[PDB]
Design a protein around this ligand. Structure first.
Ligand SMILES: CCCC(=O)OC[C@H](COP(=O)(O)O[C@@H]1[C@H](O)[C@H](OP(=O)(O)O)[C@@H](O)[C@H](OP(=O)(O)O)[C@H]1O)OC(=O)CCC
Length: 127
């Protein structure tokens, strides 16, 4: 049993030049494929773009699910964020259906560690 939810979108350093949205990734599981049984970590969209690219580089012909993308339609910021949230949740759901993508150490550090993306990358490049 694996329950993965992308939840509670929030604006970080709000009212500032470098404000951005990140998303809470809730993972609960009874599988020791994970080092922790409950995790919460916050990830921003550009971190997901990195993860998709790092998964492709390690997975050979195993197909990596698509990220939602950018819309060509104005709406509310609220409806855009909600469609994106749904796309990030579908992406993680489909990742976690592959034995091969599940085995990837970069996926485990993304979902269950507080390591930044350059620190995760430095761990793999540094052995
Ligand atoms: C870890 C260092 C990353 C670095 O600073 O680069 C980021 C840079 C972003 O430039 P760009 O290629 O335009 O990519 C943008 C960022 O990924 C941004 O992520 P975030 O800031 O929310 O996390 C999205 O919100 C934005 O979506 P939208 O346009 O509003 O629909 C997207 O276009 O380009 C990319 O990483 C390629 C993404 C396709």
């Amino acid at each position: 049993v694996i329950t993965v939810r992308v939840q509670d979108p929030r604006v970080q350093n709000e009212g500032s030049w470098n404000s951005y949205v990140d998303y809470k990734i809730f993972l609960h599981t009874n599988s020791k494929a994970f080092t922790a049984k409950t995790s919460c970590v916050r990830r921003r969209y550009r971190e997901f773009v990195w993860l998709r690219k790092q998964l492709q580089r390690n997975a050979g012909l195993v197909p990596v699910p698509e990220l939602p993308g950018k819309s060509t339609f104005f709406g509310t910021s609220d409806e855009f964020i909600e469609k994106r949230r749904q796309g990030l949740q579908h992406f993680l759901e489909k990742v976690l259906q592959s034995v091969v993508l599940l085995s990837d150490s970069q996926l485990h550090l993304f979902l269950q560690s507080q390591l930044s993306v350059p620190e995760i990358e430095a761990c793999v490049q540094g052995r």
